[PDB]
């Protein structure tokens, strides 16, 4: 019944957002809740943001 088929390939580039699941390697799960701006993040005496 099939005369021809056209296969189209899309490329999505999804960046991280709240809801994306992340984890380490010791079974420590977690969900991003908010992307805090750089200005708001904690920083050590050296000045380098976490």
């Amino acid at each position: 019944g099939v005369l021809k088929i056209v296969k189209v390939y899309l490329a999505v580039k999804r960046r991280i957002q709240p809801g994306d699941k992340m984890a380490g390697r010791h079974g420590n799960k977690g969900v991003i809740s908010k992307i805090n701006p750089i200005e708001d993040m904690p920083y050590d005496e050296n000045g380098t943001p976490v």
Binding site: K13, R15, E39, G47
Partner: protein, 230 residues
Amino acid sequence: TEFLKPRLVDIEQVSSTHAKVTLEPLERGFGHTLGNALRRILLSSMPGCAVTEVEIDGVLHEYSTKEGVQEDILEILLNLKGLAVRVQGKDEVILTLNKSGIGPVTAADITHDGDVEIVKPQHVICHLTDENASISMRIKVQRGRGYVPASTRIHSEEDERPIGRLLVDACYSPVERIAYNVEAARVEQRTDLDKLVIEMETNGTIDPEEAIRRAATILAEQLEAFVDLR
């Protein structure tokens, strides 16, 4: 009212990228007050120029591969995000890049505009492997402030949609890292009164003194609302 204002003393420029700025005398409590309030404006609100659009010939999208080039097109775009550029006169400049033969394509291969200064000419953009291979592209630098992603920009304007135009995440804000200290002043007999060292770590473009001047301006313009309007 004992209003005691600080003044800009010394700008220890260790490098064009990293520079210390000392500030004294500050009355007790104002060291951390300006320190952080300034750090915040200097991170986020500073205007700078950044590569927004690129258009390489023989390239229909960023995921494709160009012959005679070690980098995939994505990795070239990444290098152009971090290309240090200063436009003096206009807000938008489109620079042309043509180059051929065996060698690492540096930032100096771009044709410099009358009022455009490429701050790190030795900056890598692409690696040409084959002598036969030649690369051609049009790099649009626009000026903005903060960080404007390509995903935030592919969902607003989009009036002309020319196929072969690669949009790039704009890294407009020139300040990379910044951290203020507070140190003894050793002025007259004040003892309490000290200074404020703002260590700035920026790209090439924006000049340390220039930037702190702009950041103080932005703070005072936001304070118009609390002084004028009651």
